[PDB]
Design a protein around this ligand. Structure first.
Ligand SMILES: Nc1ncnc2c1ncn2[C@H]1C[C@H](O)[C@@H](COP(=O)(O)OP(=O)(O)OP(=O)(O)O)O1
Ligand SMILES: [Ca+2]
Ligand code: NA
Length: 430
DNA sequence: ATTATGACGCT
DNA sequence: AGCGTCAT
């Protein structure tokens, strides 16, 4: 009853760029705009691997992970942009720099948590309170929410998409109590107004379009964001949760897309998030652990407490390359040449990071994969990172892995290496 | 022969 | 520490 928390204390948004790497390339090259197009890495093996796909191309069935040669079978007119190659490897700098553009704009509105290269969470609780003060009881016009969907509406007693959106929005606004500064639904609505403003600023100042979710926590905001893409935002209210979750496959919720989610389904014999409500917190903890059980018990009721962390910069800076099939590294000279290539890219990124961000990495992590292993990483070792010098870092990495070599011969490497990874970590202010 | 990342949890 | 899970 009155002591039952409802997880309505915060306003949280998740902003996610639409087909991000494609937009970066389309901004640069106007010939790619409004076309079926994809971004690919490498080119020799099956036309290259697709890592991003425009919405026009998705209509033909083109997807991430598809080889370009295969994508061309579905979409013969597909246009392609290639990821830059430097020092023999894919180099993602252009996309990292575009990400900084967007993150810096978002940061003007609120503190953000960088969740990935193209998405950020925002805690809008304080901004909403402020805006509610300015509004002074004044209602919120539909004109302020030109790209907002209200999940679950319209409902109750037009056949076009935009018409439906407006009907739902009208029902929502019609029902609002703008006289109460503490009404969670009103807070979410004001949150959505601010997010329209943020999204407009991003598009004005970068050219990039995005989608967003607005709810009371990170998990619902993320879920919401995906409900209407591209170039739209979605508000998921606390009240919308029972219906939304009643047919929502468990795997759709962030963190349940893998083995844990599969075990929830298997052990409990259920399919949808809403079905979780019928178990006690102790029952869930018994199957999935203390932490997971409490989390599931709250989450299936729309409640989640993970904070939006004040962190705009990545915590690690890493460089990685696979060496598949016949290209696996089988000589010491090969291994050393590639560690150097990786170290040179890392040095470049670290030096820029130190100048931009007033910090220095203190640990170097070296990881490899050996041919045969089904695991993505076979071995990981750390050593001190005391100088931003590529030759030193590569020599140091060779030293820490050189004992993985089975070959009785000094010059040969066995089993061959199918992955190298260097990662700078443990930053300190400088 | 997906690849290149990056955060966080366990013991 | 080193490994695993999950995610973009
Ligand atoms: N598995 C991956 N491997 C390499 N790069 C990836 C991978 N997944 C995502 N990326 C890169 C390319 C994407 O443009 C960018 C953001 O990913 P993501 O948000 O999942 O999709 P997207 O921005 O391309 O499309 P959407 O409009 O569906 O969000 O990160
Ligand atoms: Ca995206
Ligand atoms: Na994303």
């Amino acid at each position: 009853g009155p002591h039952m928390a409802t997880g309505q204390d915060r306003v949280v948004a998740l902003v996610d760029m639409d087909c991000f790497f494609v937009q970066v390339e389309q901004r640069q090259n106007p010939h790619l705009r409004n076309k079926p197009c994809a971004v690919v890495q490498y080119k020799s093996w099956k036309g290259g691997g697709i890592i991003a796909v425009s919405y026009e191309a998705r209509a033909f069935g083109v997807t991430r992970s598809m080889w370009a040669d295969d994508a061309k079978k579905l979409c013969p007119d597909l246009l392609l942009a290639q990821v830059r190659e430097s020092r023999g490897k894919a180099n993602l700098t252009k996309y990292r720099e575009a990400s900084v553009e967007v993150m810096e704009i978002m940061s003007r509105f609120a503190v953000i948590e960088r969740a990935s290269i193209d998405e950020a969470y925002v805690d809008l609780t304080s901004a909403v309170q402020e805006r509610l003060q300015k509004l002074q009881g004044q209602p919120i016009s539909a004109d302020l929410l030109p790209s907002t969907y209200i999940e679950g509406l319209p409902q109750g007693p037009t056949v076009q998409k935009e018409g439906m959106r407006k009907q739902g929005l009208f029902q929502w606004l019609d029902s609002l109590q703008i006289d109460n500064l503490t009404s969670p639904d009103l807070q979410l609505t004001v949150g959505a107004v601010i997010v329209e403003e943020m999204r407009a600023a991003i598009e004005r100042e970068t050219g990039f379009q995005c989608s967003a979710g607005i709810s009371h926590n990170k998990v619902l905001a993320k879920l919401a964001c995906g409900l209407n893409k591209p170039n739209r935002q979605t508000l998921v209210s606390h009240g919308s949760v029972p219906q939304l979750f009643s047919q929502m496959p468990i795997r759709k919720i962030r963190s349940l897309g893998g083995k844990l989610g599969a075990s929830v389904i298997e052990i409990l014999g259920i399919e949808y998030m809403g079905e979780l409500t019928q178990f006690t917190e102790s029952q869930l903890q018994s199957h999935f652990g203390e932490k997971n059980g409490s989390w599931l018990y709250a989450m299936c009721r729309g409640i989640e407490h993970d904070p939006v962390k004040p962190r705009q910069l990545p915590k690690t800076i890493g460089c990685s390359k696979n060496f598949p099939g016949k290209t696996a590294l089988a000589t010491r000279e090969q291994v050393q040449w590639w560690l150097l290539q990786l170290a040179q890219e890392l040095e470049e990124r670290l030096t820029k990071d130190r100048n931009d961000n007033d910090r220095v990495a203190t640990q170097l992590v070296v990881s490899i994969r050996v041919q045969g292993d089904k695991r993505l990483s076979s071995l990981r070792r750390c050593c001190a990172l005391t100088r931003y010098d590529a030759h030193k870092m590569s020599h140091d990495a060779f030293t820490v892995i050189k004992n993985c070599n089975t070959s009785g011969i000094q010059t040969e490497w066995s089993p061959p290496l199918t992955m190298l990874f260097l990662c700078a970590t443990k930053f300190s202010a400088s």
